[PDB]
Amino acid sequence: VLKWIPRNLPSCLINVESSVTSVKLHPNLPIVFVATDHGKLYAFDLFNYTIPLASLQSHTKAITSMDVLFTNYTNNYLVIVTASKDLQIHVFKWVSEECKFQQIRSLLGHEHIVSAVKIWQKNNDVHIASCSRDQTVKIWDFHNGWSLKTFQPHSQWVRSIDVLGDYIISGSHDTTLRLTHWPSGNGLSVGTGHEFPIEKVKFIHFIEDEIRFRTPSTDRYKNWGMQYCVSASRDRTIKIWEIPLPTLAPIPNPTDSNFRCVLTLKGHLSWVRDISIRGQYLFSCADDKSVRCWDLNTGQCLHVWEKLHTGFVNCLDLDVDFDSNVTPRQMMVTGGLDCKSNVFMR
Amino acid sequence: QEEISKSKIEGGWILLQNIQMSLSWVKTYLHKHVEEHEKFKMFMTCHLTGDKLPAPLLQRT
Amino acid sequence: VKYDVNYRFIDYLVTLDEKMKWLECGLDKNDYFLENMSIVMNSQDAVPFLLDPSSHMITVISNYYGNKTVLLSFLEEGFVKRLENAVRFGSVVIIQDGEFFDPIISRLISREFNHAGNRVTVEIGDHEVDVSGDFKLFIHSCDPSGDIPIFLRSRVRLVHFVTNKESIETRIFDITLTEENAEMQRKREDLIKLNTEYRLK
Amino acid sequence: DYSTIVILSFSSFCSEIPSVSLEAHEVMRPDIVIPTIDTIKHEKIFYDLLNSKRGIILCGPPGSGKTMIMNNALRNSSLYDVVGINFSKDTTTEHILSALHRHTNYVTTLTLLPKSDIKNLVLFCDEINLPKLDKYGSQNVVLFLRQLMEKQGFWKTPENKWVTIERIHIVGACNPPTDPGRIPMSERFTRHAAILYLGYPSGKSLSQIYEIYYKAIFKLVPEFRSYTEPFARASVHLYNECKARYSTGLQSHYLFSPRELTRLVRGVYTAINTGPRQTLRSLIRLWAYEAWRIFADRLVGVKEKNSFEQLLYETVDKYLPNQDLGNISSTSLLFSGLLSLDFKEVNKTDLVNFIEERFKTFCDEELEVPMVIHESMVDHILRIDRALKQVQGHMMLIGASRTGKTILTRFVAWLNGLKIVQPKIHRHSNLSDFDMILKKAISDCSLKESRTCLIIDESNILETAFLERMNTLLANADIPDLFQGEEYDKLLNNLRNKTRSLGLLLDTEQELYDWFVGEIAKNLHVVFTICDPTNNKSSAMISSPALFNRCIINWMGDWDTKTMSQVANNMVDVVPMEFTDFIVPEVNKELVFTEPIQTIRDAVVNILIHFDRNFYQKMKVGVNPRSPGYFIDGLRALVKLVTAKYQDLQENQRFVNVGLEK
Ligand SMILES: Nc1ncnc2c1ncn2[C@@H]1O[C@H](COP(=O)(O)OP(=O)(O)O)[C@@H](O)[C@H]1O
């Protein structure tokens, strides 16, 4: 049930009045969430796509990225966080009673445009991660509405981030990756080697379902909480990277302050925009009007979705499988620059 | 320059000889000075067959 | 393709209120001068080049913007710092001796601004600086038929200022009225101003 | 003619030719020589004269191969080392001493010995004629070399003490004085040096050498190995026809040489090596594209371009009789490495759309200039990218102002990851500021290992010292007088630290400097932009021997009427202005530059193009390139003014109509 391949044709088509920049999936109900370059934010249905459920203009400029999360507590609603180019981060509310969008709070703190926003929950507390063009990635608190840590881990501004526990990555414009611990506020190790700026970078999560790149190697790496990271850049390449284990407030190793290229995956004809992980497959998109599917075991593209869009392909996602609180539904959706979005059913 | 400043402050005639021979100076400093006392008269002598003096200085004299 | 049979540039672009403002500032009565002044004022994208050998437009545009304008030159020390402070403040800047062009301000001439959200910044010298949005750049050069760099000549709007027959006639007739009958000329100019104000009203 | 002595028995050169089996990738090495009769004969006699302790001056037409015969003779011997000095229009004695200070030591026994105690040094000097006469007709460099060989030494300037030259042989190279740009040469200096006339190789010899080159190239494509001879014959015939047709009388930069054909061979190798599976039509189109990018870029007039196209058609038909040949116009050969993983032909529309999206990204990221994309500018992007991807790949863009030269260079440099560097040279900037910015650029290229696309505008050069610095930077891999004494020693320390940081280990200064200059040649591209080629400064910049022999001259020129029509339509297509009745006028075919008129938009672009033509005709511009900045500015002001006027007129009419209705 974790070995699903999407079919060669889209199940149906979703049309947006302007170009699509980010698409997200509702974890519980079959609802697709679509962003828009013109500032719109659509919310379609997986079966009735004739009319949007809710759409509004909260951002005066182009939306950059967004992600969803459903609240859980030990003592029950969906949160959508949307970033844009208007130097503002907007956190929304998706009520299930009347299926409408409610603005929670419009938040500031970035002197330039904000690229990537990440939302995660730990021990019945939901937090916001965000990186922008001001050379600083910022970790936030949702209830307080204020920042928690601010630092410059790179020479210039950063593209994308992802959070696994208390450790955060940051895809930067200087072809580097950096792990910076939140409570200590220091860099762990520096990883470089790319020739073009990073477009999307995210963690590799351990699984217990055997995938080579999704299993622990040593006991030290099992205790650390992370072993691998995947980075997509404009070098037309997807690279799996190695994170040295620090002396866990971890202390960086002077002789092991550099990363290691575990594997280099090549075969895209243009920049790799966004990537996704599902089982042993490394789903990826690019600007060559195509979507690939790379096996972590072999490093070869098993399927090619040629001419999926008429133009560039912007964003795609799957459902998170490492978390048992989210059902691993077998849905896939990919958004492109041709003002269209397509879903894949079964 | 010092004598031009002093003779502007406290008066007195002043005369410049062969101003075509310091073309950079007459293009910058004298142009700035004339571009921007009651008994102060400054005379400039020059050669007709020599180098071309700047137009705005001649139209401002 | 159709066009107006008795079209006039002044009757199309130079509106009556702007004409009143220009004539109040000290602009001459010439059709040529009015056309050139409207040409200069209608260039909000590319900076205009003024070539006025009589140094009249310096005080004309100085009187247009009041006391917020500042006069700079390419031959004065610290001109870069003065322009830096002026673009920080956001005041209209007129640069004198335009034929001695300084290639530092080539980013300002080409309008190659780097937009940073709601703040627009430009890289001049060796460091960036914010642009207030009220900044207006004028380049003045009192030397006619001089040498101009090809970069500046291509990227600015060259506007000449030469004296024609009507200017000579108007100046001579005004001078002889002032020297012959001051009261008659005063009544004439007061009636002209009153008639123009009445038409505007 | 072929008499020689082998080890006291007379023989000939027929059995002395060594068989050469060039591999595919050996063509990129610049030291590769094809041993023919003339090459081996000249190499042997040059080496014989050199061992006789004499000066050698190699006189010949440009591209005849003086430097390559030199390097062929001196590579096969450990006795001599080559020092590269390349003179400019105004070269001084201090430049010669600085290019020798790195290679020599001052020992008091003064005495200027070479650093190596077993190897002699050959002080090469190219373009001896290029130093200019004084007010009274004398040359400092030529008389310095005459002193350097006749008296074997020179007088040092600061401490006025006489030095003695021990093991510094002198080898010169110059063009005939009949060639424009050269001056008569004093007999008091030419007496001390023997002269060799290295002439142009014959057509058969060139055909054989380049048949060998194409065998080496087509070793990559085994199924087309039997077609190696017609390609060489066609290339040699094309070179001969281009030399005979386009002469110096038409344009001053129509100086062709076998170096152009070698660049053609190298481009063919690069395209084949970075290419997909190839067919005969693909080879014909690729060879035609390489010929277009090597020979026809320097052409100015449209008539010369059409003549070159017809000549290419005639050559292809005559020498390679293959059918199914497509159109070989300039814009119909779009070979790209952008849209795919390899250098292959691409369609027009998808390439244009890709350029649209990437230019949108570039405008969003680096700087916002709303440029309109047309086919000719796409072709210029492709040739600029092809020039930039090469190793040691420089370029000299020539065209009218506001053609889009520097912005295109920035866009292409951003596409390939090059870090653009522009000097902040302005008024009140001496030679020291330019020296510092070049030193910083060189250090960033070498120590920091950063890809740098340095841009030098014509206005960025104020005095000829900057031009000579660029000449030395292009001709060699670096410039000698940047690093002297303490700066030289600290750069050696920094470069040793960088080398041991990388992991590579060597101790000799010479090999470290070769690594340094190789890194500079690999990670530094210089792009020139010239606005008015009729100026004396621009003419001297173009006619410089080092700038001519290395840069790829890309004569973009003024905008033709097709480009103007394309940009006009693609910029005014967003204006609501087709709100009136139009009668299609009865006009001639030659009177309309655009498509035949059906609406008002084509009439608007036609009347604007016609007014630009009339205005530039009436200004007595002659053959001076015509700036299209007026056309763009007028069109933009037209768009803004018609939008404002339509809004005001609509508001006024609506207000008066509702007032009358009320
Ligand atoms: N075997 C050969 N015989 C003659 N010429 C050759 C041979 N091999 C290559 N060449 C040509 O000689 C050129 C090198 O000439 P070069 O030394 O640069 O001339 P110049 O000294 O005038 O700059 C090369 O471009 C190449 O095309």
Ligand SMILES: Nc1ncnc2c1ncn2[C@@H]1O[C@H](COP(=O)(O)OP(=O)(O)O)[C@@H](O)[C@H]1O
């Ligand atoms: N096709 C075009 N459409 C609109 N503007 C253009 C076009 N080509 C060039 N330009 C103008 O030219 C300018 C850039 O030219 P640039 O390369 O800087 O010229 P130069 O190299 O002579 O300095 C831009 O500001 C742009 O407005």
